[PDB]
Amino acid sequence: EGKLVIWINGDKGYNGLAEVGKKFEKDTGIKVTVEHPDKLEEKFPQVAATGDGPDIIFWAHDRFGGYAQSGLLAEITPAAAFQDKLYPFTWDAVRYNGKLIAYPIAVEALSLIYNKDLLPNPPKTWEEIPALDKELKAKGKSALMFNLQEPYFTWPLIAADGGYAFKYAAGKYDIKDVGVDNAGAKAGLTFLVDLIKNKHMNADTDYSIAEAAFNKGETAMTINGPWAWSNIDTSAVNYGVTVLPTFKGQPSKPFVGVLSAGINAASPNKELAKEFLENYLLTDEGLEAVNKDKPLGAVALKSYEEELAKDPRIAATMENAQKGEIMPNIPQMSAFWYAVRTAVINAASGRQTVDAALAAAQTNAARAAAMSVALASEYQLVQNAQLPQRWSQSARKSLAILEATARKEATAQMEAAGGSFCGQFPVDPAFKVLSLEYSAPNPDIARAIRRVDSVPNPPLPSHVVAIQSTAVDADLSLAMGVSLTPGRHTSYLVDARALQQSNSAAVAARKADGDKWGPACDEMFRGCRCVTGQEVVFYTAVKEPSLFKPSFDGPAFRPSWGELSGKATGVVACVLQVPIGKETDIICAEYDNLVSKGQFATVTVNMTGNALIQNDGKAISKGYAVAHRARVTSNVYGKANDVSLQRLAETVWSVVEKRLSFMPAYRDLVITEQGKPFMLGATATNIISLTENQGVMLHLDTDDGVWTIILWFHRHSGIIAGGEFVLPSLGISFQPLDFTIVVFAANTIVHGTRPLQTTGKIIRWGSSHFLRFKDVNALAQLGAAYGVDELDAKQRDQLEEVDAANSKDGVGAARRVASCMAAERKAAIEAQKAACVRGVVMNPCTGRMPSLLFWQVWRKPP
Ligand SMILES: O=C1O[C@H]([C@@H](O)CO)C(O)=C1O
Ligand SMILES: [Fe+3]
């Protein structure tokens, strides 16, 4: 690769780091690029999981231990002589499982910040503050205001006398040993609430109130970090930054954040990143260059820290950090934070006793941390799950004979008819269908009748191979749960490495075109082979050692094709041609019913199904707002549209499942008991889209299920030019005919639809049946909080109450009522979410569903 890509947050001094990068290009001739991507917390583990991303990542050490569990970070091997150049505790912050996993850069912690004019000598102890507030109240001021809403800010006091998140021992944090409940933590929080009850502090004080008050000279003290200094620097306040007050003679223990630089485990530039960080960045001039852009605060490098500590504010930061506790670098901190946030809010407001608040927090944090471990175990079993065994040597031989017989029938039939047909559409793979004509001779669906424009059909790209052998066909059919029309289908093998490369190229082309079908996407398209009118399946083959995660410890089958040995196969795409009939009648009828009854909501794209639109404050049950209203306002049958949606989802599913037996297996694996009532019928669909003569840019979906179904049907007669569905990383494209369905892995296969031009009245209706997991999780959560069957009654009540406010007092009053409901809903969702209530099985590393399922390992030993 011979280059270095670095990700750092936008709030840091990246241009200063970019200057350090130049000086690196000088000596080694290696370019250093420094990007600052938004949502960086979540972006790195999602991209690094696939062997992609930067060489170097810059973030707080706390996240890095989770990354280390996922093997996304390289073990750094610094010499004992380099390790001396940094404070030993900062090295402790970047240790996971005996191993060093990142380079410490900067050190941050809360300090006491005080107004020098109101308070020349800040108190040494918390115990003095009540007396000090009494004095300052007489002058119309207050002693102390800081954020009471987030436990980060209140924890220093709580930790002082004892009290910790998880007990650290032998290089590990004990998940089962939470320190929320001890006498130490109890005393700390007691003192905090005593300050509130004795009117020294207000329970509603948040970050903004505290910052405003201190920066305007209204309060003598606040508690904040180095990020807050810039704002105070613009104000009239003469301020100092000092050691946090002691409690019962012990130091307040703020959490310590260590900004760190980790090396990507999938980076080919490991020894040159080691070079860059050790010799160019972790030096006085190195950190100086960064410091001059945006200040680092305290730093891990002893020599430069001695310089910075000349600023008393930096000195105070380090001192508080050393008296503090390194923030645990494990994901189970989320459990700690939610439970402690609830406890502090409750104890401060009087909703619970300090003793009651901490007792519940201890119990809940331990429970939630235990469950999250259990969920990670189960996810591994999900990723590694195998289809029910249908494959055997005798079964594949049997199936190959059947398939061979069917190929002869299909040939004889083709001979008799003068060629191949999909419905009435003449199918010739020598040609690419660039435009085509549909006729509508009756009120049924318009039918593809004639190829209009064509070019000679481009060959398959080199990484995609049509499978010739019936034995191999039967091998894959039986192992992958795919049963296409006998003698009338093609199977393909796609090289997994090249598939991922082509995905990247496709995304690049769309970006270059400016998020649109332009020249670069067109050039890719010109290389895609037409499979219009075909029934096809694409298997990807992963070589045993990536985007794909097969378990090579899984059971192996013996392939008839030796080229499959040492490889795992998964189904990435399947194109079906549904014969016009009862099922297509039912499906198209439901679309018409849902369109007529105003049940498609506009987001463009029209949508329906079991959504939960959280932007709608009053939404508390499954569906779009139109669905909620119809359940109430209907004078015939409240459930009518839900019967329609279930039949729609179930009929499409049934058609797909006849051909793809892995689909119900996927449904059963990833939909939880709590998610089932919020899926549309017995399917893996919760949302259904609808498009009218529309293209869509090439893209990967992110927050959808493992497989997505798309179908098309046509309404009037006419000619359509363009509008191909394109799978550029598979090197194929097609025109939808009478009733074409594609089932494909939408999170891992790039896809889109070219713009259309039409002649006549022809409408091509496109529709995706998919799993949008955010809706099913939130709904499963609401179901756990209120009861699945209570949601309709809540929705009816919430609609009535919002209507009343509008009818009585205006739009403003009603939207305030909706705003109230939204907060209450939020709190309920949040509480269930903390209890690990889920609608679907998800990757704890990525927060997404697995990239594929049901991998089959093939091995042919001699
Ligand atoms: O290429 C696409 O076309 C369909 C659209 O017709 C239905 O939404 C969709 O899901 C895309 O990603
Ligand atoms: Fe899509």
UniProtKB/Swiss-Prot annotation:
Gene that this polypeptide is encoded by: CMD1
Residues the entry annotates as binding Fe cation: H699, D701, H751
Organism: Chlamydomonas reinhardtii
Record-given protein name: 5-methylcytosine-modifying enzyme 1
Lineage of producing organism: Eukaryota, Viridiplantae, Chlorophyta, core chlorophytes, Chlorophyceae
Residues the entry annotates as binding L-ascorbate: S689, L690, T691, H751, G752, T753
Top-level EC class: oxidoreductase
Chief location bin: nucleus
Keywords assigned by UniProt, alphabetized: Dioxygenase, Iron, Metal-binding, Nucleus, Oxidoreductase
Role of this protein: Dioxygenase that catalyzes DNA modification by mediating the conversion of the modified genomic base 5-methylcytosine (5mC) into 5-glyceryl-methylcytosine (5gmC). Catalyzes the conjugation of a glyceryl moiety from L-ascorbate (vitamin C) to the methyl group of 5mC through a carbon-carbon bond. 5gmC DNA modification may be required during photosynthesis as an epigenetic mark that couteracts DNA methylation.
